[PDB]
Ligand binder design. Structure first.
Ligand code: HEM
Ligand code: HEM
Ligand code: HEM
Ligand code: HEM
Ligand SMILES: c1cncc(CCCNCCc2ccnc(-n3ccnc3)n2)c1
Ligand SMILES: c1cncc(CCCNCCc2ccnc(-n3ccnc3)n2)c1
Ligand SMILES: c1cncc(CCCNCCc2ccnc(-n3ccnc3)n2)c1
Ligand SMILES: c1cncc(CCCNCCc2ccnc(-n3ccnc3)n2)c1
Ligand SMILES: C[C@H](O)[C@H](O)[C@H]1CNc2nc(N)[nH]c(=O)c2N1
Ligand SMILES: C[C@H](O)[C@H](O)[C@H]1CNc2nc(N)[nH]c(=O)c2N1
Ligand SMILES: C[C@H](O)[C@H](O)[C@H]1CNc2nc(N)[nH]c(=O)c2N1
Ligand SMILES: C[C@H](O)[C@H](O)[C@H]1CNc2nc(N)[nH]c(=O)c2N1
Ligand SMILES: [Zn+2]
Ligand SMILES: [Zn+2]
Lengths: 411, 420, 411, 420
């Protein structure tokens, strides 16, 4: 209603038909009179939980082609009686694995989704302490890093109960570099992590006060106060950045960590909320070379690189910024590849995604995709996704944003 | 329910408050459940293009516009206001249409631009030359007016924004149309090869010109003739006199071989297939023009696979290793091509803006609009340049998109609606 | 999107979940800011026809559980090649029957839909002349009337081609009484048919000028001028109206035809348009007893019946109209039943409809329903449908209104 | 795509033109593809009931309201208007809410009634006694106010339209609520045999009263006590003085046995569980009362299967043959029941209107509204009486349904939300 929505690719003229949108039950933020597509960010009762859980179990049995089976009906009644008696329910191992892979599949902002069926799911629902999370997270990192041959993974910690016993990873990612405010107003390190860094220092962390200090983990178990753990540095794979042509590039002293791991999202499955669900894939080059390095509010390195390139920086029309941007990203890929750390360029990534998408239309009736995020932050129209119309809508299971734990936690 | 909306700029932390969207009356295409932000021509429940506004459609569209004009000149509720409203209503009642005053036409056109959420050049919105062509009755008349526009707008390379507005629709069978999508474009030819010579985007329109008697030079940069429809008649061919057509040969400040690629482009960017809608009136022929942002030419026109597709050609001459995508040879060539376009326009003294300059200006414009107007409808998908996105400020700037009227609307290509 | 909608019955507290609304592709008339629920009324190119045909063919093959089969794929090719060469296509007999039955099934304004699958389909697509139409219509009347034991049926004449060769039954119904405007402004007969009666007279029909004269048929074949045909009187079943207690009722001289046959609607199946598709079922009493007899703009008999009942007509609060109304409707039912003419009272009808809805929600995931039309014109809240929430949406195949042929026709 | 809309009456052929709907700001719950005209409480994308208005929601709702008020007294753009508007904004900015002047409160209450698309009594909209109870602080305070209301409204049988408005929501933790759905209703008791003694619609609420200390007489027409919640506190019980509760014994003007059925009803129909929204301000306790239409009692209260369900009992005393539906025994008893109710109220000099008279007035009302206001939002499903529909003019009247503010809204039953 409308049953069918068409997307057109204006390069290839290929038109696909979406019916997957019909399965959407959650609102996106737009209305018929306003679109919020460029906005970054547009206690479960018994009554509420029965249907959310039914929706999921049905979806799961439909997927293994056993919809309506004695197993289907049995699980359905077990879950319902489990929620009747305990006001919540627990997922089967099969269900947890399926739901996690499907949240990834449904992540409309992730360009990496062709990989969605290949995900190592670590079940950490038996975890009860912060040192326990730290062990789990350490296993996760080691597995995923795999000496540079990166592997996709997630670690799922216990679901929320009453919102007062929440497991959280306070880090926004498992591995980031610290940020420190200087007396002159500037930032040393990554300006994104100044606040988090302060909380760590305030919690006892001894900072090297350098440009690329790997942050400690701040782990919260069962609603308790978070505890500081340092990841063993042998476990943290880093890649020093150099240029295949410019030998002065290494002189800039730039590096980045190999493992991209989001740790501040909330994984929702059948109405259950896993508020500590760190996951990791591998890097697309532009995340590091365009955003992390060249965002004005990040490491902001365009000026220095341009200087060493000896470019005329007097006029914007010389595109000196654009020239540096390419060399920078060239270096990042050149460096990761040279050290045999899994990395993908934006051309290759975006081509894979179009393929994934066409697969998804063929086998699922659509692929929710957020154009604003999917198109790379440089060279946009020279990638195929720029010319690909997309539909954005919300499917469950999903990954969602949640408040930063340090805004709602009482010590 | 109605509420003010915040947009945040994620680099500057600046937060603006949108109130203007509460005045929106037209649909965006999205729903509460499905966002259509990247669909080019979403369906918006707009009435069929072959149909004309009824009285019941015209009465409120006209009142809305007359109200906002008199509001804009601080005369709202005045006797002039009331009388103008009374006159407009009688015209619609007795003729089922009405005629805009000259003042209202200029205001209307300016605001359609102001409201064009896809235009990054809108800081210039109140400096628009308006040629009122409503007395035009023939194709040759349209030719004359268009030559005037091209001449005035080109201004020997010191481009001036302009729009020429032909008579509004009536019964729907007497429409004025410029068949050309732009005033100045290059022919496209399908080759025995299977390849396309020239601009592939213009292959169909070129076939029509040839079917109508045009004699194609059959080269790579043949300026197309105008195809002009006046008063619902069959369109006639006119060659724009070539001295009025400003072109820039493309060369590079460092690579001497670049000029040998034989690239060039035209100075005057002029859209001619849109519909200008003011107070329910529809101006189906309203070509308008500003000046280029370099990426328009260097990225899209030159490097789209479905356009001139020159990436491989240029990469060859730069001696790039094109065996792996991860050498980013494509992006490297793209930047150089775009350096050349900007350099060339500047050298020939032809107005052009680079994407850094244009986007910084758009941010300024937005801040002005929020302060003086309560917001600024903007389509992030179109506003962010096609290369180097996140190193321009607009990438980091949240934008609300909504449709205010007066506006520029899309309309069907005329060769799909016209009977001969 | 939303995937699930819920309807509640406020008498029984039963909640049903609609998913069938997702299949909708046609607009209703409402927007999010205005509801048009009580408004009575809120040629196809090659490209337009392909998807319409495909949608129908698909749903047809899905309905017989042969979707994706060999046969399905071939029928799709056949139709697409047929449109490509002829700019139209022909339905197989099986498809015509399926579409007709489903148009009925989807008719949100019809309360008799429990019978939807019991529809006799007469394929009149070979018809070429008005006399041909006349012969077909007599068959339909004889068959459907069936000596009083009414049978549902539809007769489908050829589909639109270029829009200049349409088949049309100009009669709004196959059987109706004439209406003659009197000099004093009043009307003899059925005021709703004055315009059509005049047309008929103009075409050379000799009017009896009575209160219950059966109109002739005006038949348009192949876009030609309509021709007159008198239905053989023996085929027109009629019921004299009498009351089981009021012996004076028969003296009112009232009567009515037994066969309710709608003849002015358009049947749309898979993009094809059947502009002449007369259909018939049987009467719900209130159609005659309330609307035909007691509409102010129809036979408007309330006053004379009230007079014969010796009611105090001086104050509205004596509810004399309501009293008269009930007695008139008792008379209609009693009359039809006595003569063994099929008829349903509005209680039985609405009970059956609720039962139908529940079936439809079970086996189809919903049932489009126009509450404004489904709830009977008297005694609304003592019928179950009054208390039943309903969702209205347009499914295809469908019956559509079309403009009166005497507003379009050039002679 | 805004347009005037036409509504037709199909008996009289009168056609009216609706311009007022263009003002509508709230959602009906329909979409273009799915009509929800018969859904009692459609999702209309309204914020969570337990949430309060933010500054960003409040500013535009307040401006819309103040604008329509000054426009109403023909002073739009005046100094008073500009000053009042500035004053309201300062209060919102400073306190995150604001206060209505007495004039604005009266105007608002009256317009909520005028805007109520489900009320057939709206020809009376301008004659409304507003009791301003915004100085109330206690449950006993509410009780006194409510007694004043019942006494004024009842006026010894000559009923008068009235509303009592209690303090507005603040942080939603100090809400004022009348837990009763109506000021005057009868208890209901579930019985061991599974039947209900009294009104089944009030079983849950009765249980709450009994659990709170109310001593039930456990009869068939027990007048319920008030459960009053002041300032977010737990509610308190108050029995209304029985001499303030006017009741009518039901008898039949021909059927002598009818009185033996022991039926009676109350004279004052007073809704007390709705939310009055004026300019973003939310009045969660706003009991209002008018007078009964006959069918509300005779058809719904007495013949609904889920209410008093008296049909078969009356039918037996009429010695009807109840063996077949087609005898229309139900329809017969129904009419007799509704005659008895009207006769009884009239005989006791207690104001009441029959459905024929009431709907004729509504048509007249509509026609006035269209003339002076350009529209009348109306919900046909609710406006058409529940018996003898098509013999009332409203059945044949096309109506457009849209939501205007100020308005009366539904809010969750207090016991489903309240913390003790
Ligand atoms: C395996 C290789 C992967 C690649 C190349 C990839 C690529 C990307 C990229 C480039 C982004 C944009 C991030 C930003 O701009 O902030 C993203 C976001 C995202 N990805 Fe992936 N991804 C991969 C694996 C995964 C996995 C394993 C998951 C979860 C199981 C996942 C789920 C998500 C989600 C939920 C987002 C949204 C992040 C946010 O909103 O902040 N992706 N992905
Ligand atoms: C004066 C300098 C101007 C600049 C730098 C500029 C820039 C741009 C750019 C880069 C686009 C995107 C075009 C595309 O990618 O297809 C655009 C589109 C647009 N501009 Fe401008 N523009 C200017 C003047 C104008 C004027 C004078 C008008 C109208 C009076 C206007 C109205 C529009 C409209 C309606 C579009 C959307 C076109 C479409 O939807 O295809 N602009 N502008
Ligand atoms: C078999 C017993 C049937 C019963 C009891 C029945 C009952 C009704 C009733 C009471 C109406 C309302 C008509 C009005 O108030 O103007 C109606 C309308 C309608 N019926 Fe049926 N019907 C039957 C058979 C059929 C059949 C066989 C079809 C088609 C195959 C059909 C399709 C329709 C349609 C399309 C309408 C809407 C009429 C309009 O919009 O003008 N019905 N029906
Ligand atoms: C003066 C004589 C009045 C008459 C004859 C009358 C008639 C009616 C009727 C028959 C209903 C349908 C109720 C139902 O079936 O549940 C109704 C509803 C309603 N009335 Fe009135 N009314 C009157 C006065 C008022 C007044 C004074 C107000 C407010 C100040 C008002 C506001 C409403 C509202 C908001 C509804 C909808 C109630 C709901 O949705 O539950 N009415 N009216
Ligand atoms: C402003 C507002 N709101 C949010 C942000 C940052 C969001 C970060 N999104 C994910 C970034 C990221 C980092 C590392 N790895 C991955 N990652 C891993 C797998 N797929 C993506 N994503 C800034
Ligand atoms: C796919 C689908 N549907 C449409 C398109 C092309 C839209 C063209 N947009 C306008 C491009 C253009 C050309 C020349 N000048 C200007 N221009 C001049 C001033 N402002 C814009 N724009 C592609
Ligand atoms: C007012 C406005 N715009 C249109 C109309 C025509 C209403 C006709 N609806 C169908 C009436 C009818 C007559 C005879 N039979 C049947 N019928 C047969 C089966 N189902 C219904 N319906 C009236
Ligand atoms: C199911 C769901 N959700 C709600 C209901 C009952 C709705 C009650 N509407 C008001 C009934 C009423 C009672 C007494 N007086 C008045 N009343 C007074 C003035 N105007 C109407 N209305 C049933
Ligand atoms: C304002 C805008 O939404 C914001 O800058 C977005 C744009 N697109 C993005 N796309 C990706 N992949 N990642 C981002 O952080 C952003 N930032
Ligand atoms: C599918 C996508 O919307 C389409 O390619 C858009 C993207 N953004 C654009 N932006 C501009 N300025 N011009 C365009 O033609 C497009 N094309
Ligand atoms: C105005 C209103 O929509 C119109 O009178 C409708 C109401 N409901 C109806 N319901 C049926 N079944 N038939 C009708 O003709 C009508 N008429
Ligand atoms: C399902 C339907 O919306 C519901 O039963 C409505 C119908 N019309 C009504 N009309 C009025 N006046 N009051 C009601 O309670 C109802 N109930
Ligand atoms: Zn959107
Ligand atoms: Zn609706």
């Amino acid at each position: 209603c409308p049953r069918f929505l068409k997307v057109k690719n204006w390069e290839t003229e290929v038109v696909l038909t979406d019916t997957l949108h019909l399965k959407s039950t959650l609102e996106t933020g737009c209305t018929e009179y306003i679109c919020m597509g460029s906005i970054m960010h547009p206690v479960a009762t018994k009554d509420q939980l029965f249907p959310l859980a039914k929706e999921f179990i049905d979806q799961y049995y439909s997927s293994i082609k056993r919809f309506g089976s004695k197993a289907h009906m049995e699980r359905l009644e077990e879950v319902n009686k489990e929620i009747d008696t305990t006001s919540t329910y627990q997922l089967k191992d099969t269900e947890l694995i399926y739901g996690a892979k499907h949240a990834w599949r449904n992540a409309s902002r992730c360009v990496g989704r062709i990989q969605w069926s290949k995900l190592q799911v670590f079940d950490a629902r038996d975890c009860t302490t912060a040192h326990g999370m730290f062990n789990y997270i350490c296993n996760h990192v080691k597995y995923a890093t795999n000496k540079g041959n990166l592997r996709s993974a997630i670690t799922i910690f216990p679901q929320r109960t009453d919102g007062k016993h929440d497991f959280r990873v306070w880090n926004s990612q498992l591995i980031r570099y610290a940020g420190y405010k200087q007396p002159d107003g500037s930032t040393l390190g990554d300006p994104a992590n100044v606040q988090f860094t302060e909380i760590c220092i305030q919690q006892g962390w001894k900072p090297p006060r350098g440009r690329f200090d790997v942050l400690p983990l701040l782990l919260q178990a069962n609603g308790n106060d978070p505890e500081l753990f340092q990841i063993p540095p042998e476990l943290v794979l880093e890649v020093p950045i150099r240029h295949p042509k410019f030998e002065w590039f290494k002189d800039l002293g730039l590096k980045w960590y190999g493992l991209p791991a989001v740790s501040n999202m909330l994984l929702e499955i059948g109405g259950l909320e896993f508020s500590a669900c760190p996951f990791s894939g591998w890097y697309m080059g532009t995340e590091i070379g365009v955003r992390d390095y060249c965002d004005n509010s990040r490491y902001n390195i365009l000026e220095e690189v341009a200087k060493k390139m000896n470019l005329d920086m007097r006029k914007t029309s010389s595109l000196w910024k654009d020239q540096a941007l390419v060399e920078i990203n060239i270096a990042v890929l050149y460096s990761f590849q040279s050290d045999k750390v899994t990395i993908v360029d934006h051309h290759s990534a975006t081509e894979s995604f179009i393929k994934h998408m066409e697969n998804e239309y063929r086998c699922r009736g659509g692929c929710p995709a957020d154009w604003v995020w999917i198109v790379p932050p440089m060279s946009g129209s020279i990638t195929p996704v720029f010319h690909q119309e997309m539909l954005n809508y919300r499917l469950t299971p999903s990954f969602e944003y949640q408040p930063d734990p340090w805004n709602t936690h009482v010590w």
